[PDB]
Amino acid sequence: GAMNSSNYAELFNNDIKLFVDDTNVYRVTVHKTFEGNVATKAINGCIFTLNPKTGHLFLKIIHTSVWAGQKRLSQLAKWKTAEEVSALVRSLPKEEQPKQIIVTRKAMLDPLEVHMLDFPNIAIRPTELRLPFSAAMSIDKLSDVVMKATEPQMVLFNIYDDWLDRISSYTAFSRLTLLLRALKTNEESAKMILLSDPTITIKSYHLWPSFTDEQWITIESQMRDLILTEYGRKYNV
Amino acid sequence: MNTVPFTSAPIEVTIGIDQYSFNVKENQPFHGIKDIPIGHVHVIHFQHADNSSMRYGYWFDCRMGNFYIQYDPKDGLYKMMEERDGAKFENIVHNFKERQMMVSYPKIDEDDTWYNLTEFVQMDKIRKIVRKDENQFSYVDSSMTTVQENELSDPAHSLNYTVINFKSREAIRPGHEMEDFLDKSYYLNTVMLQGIFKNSSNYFGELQFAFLNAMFFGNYGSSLQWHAMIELICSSATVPKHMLDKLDEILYYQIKTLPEQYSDILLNERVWNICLYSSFQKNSLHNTEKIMENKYPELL
């Protein structure tokens, strides 16, 4: 069925599953033509496919060349997403294939269902949670690899860096969604918090700074303040 | 003109023949139906005064034999049976006509309603959907489930309709996933027309027979199948010109014939809005669209 607060813990059980987010697949900069009209110009995107338990991210980079000479791009984009997720499952060994795939936007349901007809035992599910995966492109290293790609390309990351050595998947997913939620609500301030102390660095094989346990508590706190703040500024409370 | 005599009418029952019906009282002297137009299939159907649960009925073609109705007090229904003794039948009928105990199939001559609803329906195909080959006629009722429905329980009592699913491998060519899902032309033209039904006439016949079981028996599955077949055509970008024009006619008379207070259950909002307003063929169903707007604008 659908995924929500009542069944939140299933994400971290031992049944393999993947989140698919399509928000960043088709990206445009809308501009003005010399004749005064408006045109879009595409830039590279990515499909954001994430195992919430292990932290493995399957970053499929969508190169602008895929849109060349096509129509109804916002619709095509959901079907390209679904083709590429299906190709990824097919590429995986049987014991690595997910038992469920949760799409973060309900519009991906039919496109994925149809590409996955060959996998009738994989449940395709929506969710009622308003997850912040759209902010994935606020992570510099993920943004950089997408904007630099010259061809279609799949890049693998662990979006939890080494956190699972010290915390549970549930805590690690909570930390990730809080960081992403802060980046989405005020990217500038959020990044300021993450790099305020020049002494804490990002390992070359990580995405996030190397905080101690005490420092992450302090970071997480500051991220919560920011999310509440922007909610006051937005709504005035 | 042919005749279906009735042994008796021991229980109070509303009796239909095609789109006509009349109330018969318990033990009223009623001995059958005469002047039934030859050349078409027909359906005789029943709804007991006491338990409106279970509309039931029989499809038949008078050309294929001599048929009669007799109440069975063990199974508790009006049963169709075939008489093999030819002169026994004529004699039974002639005596009944003489005593004028039979109603006349009351066809207005201006009226082609029945033909139009049954244009493509052939007893040969009905008997392949309703399997029971020791009889030349076909029993249908309110509660019978389809083979497709039984998938998702008793097969002898199934409506073996054509399995149709818009999210199946039969419908979607590997590597044309998006193409085939948003334009079902492949499914309609290659899989179903060329492959399964062979020509449009067989397709339309199943379509018409599904509508008729929906309307006459309120068979839910028949309504789902009828709706689905329509949807496979309206959602095809490429349909033979002759099918499109005929479809408008077919649907026109089904919508015309439907009881006005049964629209809530036998008609699916999504399908009709899509077919008439959003699909490829939104502009090819002029007659059907017109009659839907003047008669059921609430649905849209």
Ligand SMILES: COc1ccc(CO)c(OC)c1OC
């Ligand atoms: C799949 O849902 C359904 C179930 C049963 C029938 C009729 O047997 C249907 O009409 C096609 C149907 O819609 C597809």
